[PDB]
């Protein structure tokens, strides 16, 4: 009985002033002009919070050189961190990963500073390595056993990798590639959570739940293509490397393929469930824009209902649609602070398939590469509002005050 985000939902989806961030402005400077940098995450603690070793705070980000074409950045993506005392000002860490890394690439996931100091970086191994042509083949690996030393001078991450795969889709519940119908298939962006209810230890991935042909399955069999869903697997042990998969927590079937970088925030009583989607992920009849979509529920696998009526959360204005994606929402306080990337800016009306036209000069400087804005936003039950924004990428503790409004 998985709950569903339905077309009667999406039906509904709208910009409004509590919905749409402030223009996005580039930066003063590049804390790396030789790397553009997107979908960021944050090394936290078991319980969820951001973690802190010698008063440092470590991020991770998808990494591609500066000189590269935007468009062809997630073909060579590459797992860099980066550490800060104060949350505005980052030093570039270099990458996390020396040594045999799975996949011919590495895509979005999560990061986990037990409470025994072991050092665990969940990642998506896209392709396998050293392959000839390159495939769209994802699962949810772990690069375990590291170690992160920080001194006054700064942090670097040290010792052995070990690598492995953790996940690949089953066949019921989570759509395999070789069952792929419409675009191609989603097994990737694993999100470590542990339930601060139950003290059980889960791991969240993007998924698709596959729907046979002839299913009826859908009002429209192309609308089955777009089976997009927010897969759960748990970990009897809480061993961050053994995990069963679970029932998905929500499908986005007949509505959306792409339910990007799904994670929980728990706040007083309640379980906000947050992906990121694009807007040439909708299905037909469907108009919503590259947004964060949001869900509520009681219990962490409960009857998740759409924020706001519709799920938008947060998106772009009209006038630069595409200035930020792939959105984190993470506590501080009484507030819910939102950390995307810093997109596609300066269109002037093009579409995403308008900009590989453009000359390479061209398409490069119409692409951030760094972190957008945190947007401030407060939850009030099933309803979000944008309450302001601080600095490019800032990521503070709970300990830190914000300024007023
Ligand atoms: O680069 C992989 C990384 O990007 C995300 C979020 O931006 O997904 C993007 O890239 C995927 C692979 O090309 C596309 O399928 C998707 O449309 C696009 O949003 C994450 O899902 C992933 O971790």
Same mark, same amino acid.
């Given at each position: 009985?998985?709950?569903?985000?339905?077309?009667?939902?999406?039906?509904?989806?709208?910009?409004?002033?509590?919905?749409?961030?402030?223009?996005?402005?580039?930066?003063?400077?590049?804390?790396?002009?030789?790397?553009?940098?997107?979908?960021?995450?944050?090394?936290?603690?078991?319980?969820?919070?951001?973690?802190?070793?010698?008063?440092?705070?470590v991020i991770f980000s998808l990494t591609a050189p500066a000189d590269l074409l935007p468009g062809k950045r997630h073909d060579v993506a590459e797992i860099r961190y980066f550490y800060s005392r104060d949350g505005e000002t980052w030093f570039d860490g270099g990458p996390v990963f020396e040594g045999g890394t799975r996949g011919s690439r590495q895509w979005a996931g999560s990061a986990l500073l037990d409470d025994d100091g072991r050092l665990y970086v969940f990642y998506t191994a896209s392709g396998r390595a050293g392959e000839a042509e390159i495939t769209y083949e994802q699962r949810l690996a772990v690069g375990s056993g590291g170690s992160v030393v920080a001194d006054d001078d700064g942090?670097?991450?040290?010792?052995?990798?070990?690598?492995?795969?953790?996940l690949e889709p089953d066949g019921e519940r989570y759509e395999r590639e070789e069952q792929s119908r419409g675009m191609i298939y989603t097994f990737r962006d694993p999100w470590f959570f542990?339930?601060? &209810?139950? $003290?059980?230890? %889960? @791991?969240?991935?993007?998924?698709?739940?596959?729907?046979?042909?002839?299913?009826?399955?859908?009002? +429209?069999?192309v609308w089955e293509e777009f089976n997009g869903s927010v897969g759960i697997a748990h970990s009897p042990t809480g061993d961050p490397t053994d995990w069963e998969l679970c029932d998905p927590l929500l499908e986005g079937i007949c509505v959306n393929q792409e339910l990007e970088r799904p994670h929980v925030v728990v &706040?007083? $009583?309640?379980? %906000? @469930?947050?992906?990121?989607?694009?807007?040439?992920?909708?299905?037909?009849?469907?108009?919503?824009? +590259?947004?964060?979509?949001?869900?509520?529920?009681?219990?962490?696998?409960?009857?998740?209902?759409?924020?706001?009526?519709?799920?938008?959360?947060?998106?772009?204005?009209?006038?630069?649609?595409?200035?930020?994606?792939?959105?984190?929402?993470?506590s501080h306080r009484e507030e819910l602070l939102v950390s995307g990337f810093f997109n596609y800016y300066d269109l002037g009306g093009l579409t995403l398939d308008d900009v590989a036209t453009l000359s390479p000069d061209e398409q490069r400087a119409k692409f951030g590469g760094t972190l957008a804005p945190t947007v401030r936003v407060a939850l009030s039950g099933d309803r979000t509002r944008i309450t302001g924004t601080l600095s490019h990428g800032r990521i503070p503790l709970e300990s830190e005050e914000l300024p007023d409004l």
């Amino acid at each position: 009985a998985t709950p569903r985000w339905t077309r009667e939902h999406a039906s509904k989806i709208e910009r409004t002033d509590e919905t749409v961030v402030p223009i996005i402005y580039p930066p003063r400077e590049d804390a790396a002009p030789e790397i553009n940098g997107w979908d960021t995450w944050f090394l936290r603690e078991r319980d969820g919070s951001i973690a802190t070793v010698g008063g440092w705070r470590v991020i991770f980000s998808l990494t591609a050189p500066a000189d590269l074409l935007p468009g062809k950045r997630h073909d060579v993506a590459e797992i860099r961190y980066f550490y800060s005392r104060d949350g505005e000002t980052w030093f570039d860490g270099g990458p996390v990963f020396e040594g045999g890394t799975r996949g011919s690439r590495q895509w979005a996931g999560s990061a986990l500073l037990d409470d025994d100091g072991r050092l665990y970086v969940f990642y998506t191994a896209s392709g396998r390595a050293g392959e000839a042509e390159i495939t769209y083949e994802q699962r949810l690996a772990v690069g375990s056993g590291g170690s992160v030393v920080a001194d006054d001078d700064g942090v670097r991450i040290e010792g052995p990798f070990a690598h492995g795969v953790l996940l690949e889709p089953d066949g019921e519940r989570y759509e395999r590639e070789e069952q792929s119908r419409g675009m191609i298939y989603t097994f990737r962006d694993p999100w470590f959570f542990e339930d601060p &209810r139950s $003290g059980k230890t %889960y @791991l969240l991935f993007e998924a698709n739940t596959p729907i046979p042909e002839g299913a009826g399955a859908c009002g +429209d069999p192309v609308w089955e293509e777009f089976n997009g869903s927010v897969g759960i697997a748990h970990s009897p042990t809480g061993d961050p490397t053994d995990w069963e998969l679970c029932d998905p927590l929500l499908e986005g079937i007949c509505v959306n393929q792409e339910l990007e970088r799904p994670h929980v925030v728990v &706040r007083n $009583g309640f379980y %906000y @469930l947050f992906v990121s989607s694009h807007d040439h992920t909708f299905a037909p009849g469907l108009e919503g824009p +590259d947004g964060l979509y949001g869900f509520v529920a009681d219990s962490l696998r409960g009857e998740y209902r759409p924020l706001n009526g519709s799920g938008l959360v947060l998106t772009n204005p009209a006038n630069a649609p595409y200035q930020a994606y792939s959105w984190v929402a993470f506590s501080h306080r009484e507030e819910l602070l939102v950390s995307g990337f810093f997109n596609y800016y300066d269109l002037g009306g093009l579409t995403l398939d308008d900009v590989a036209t453009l000359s390479p000069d061209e398409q490069r400087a119409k692409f951030g590469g760094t972190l957008a804005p945190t947007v401030r936003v407060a939850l009030s039950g099933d309803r979000t509002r944008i309450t302001g924004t601080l600095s490019h990428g800032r990521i503070p503790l709970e300990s830190e005050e914000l300024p007023d409004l």
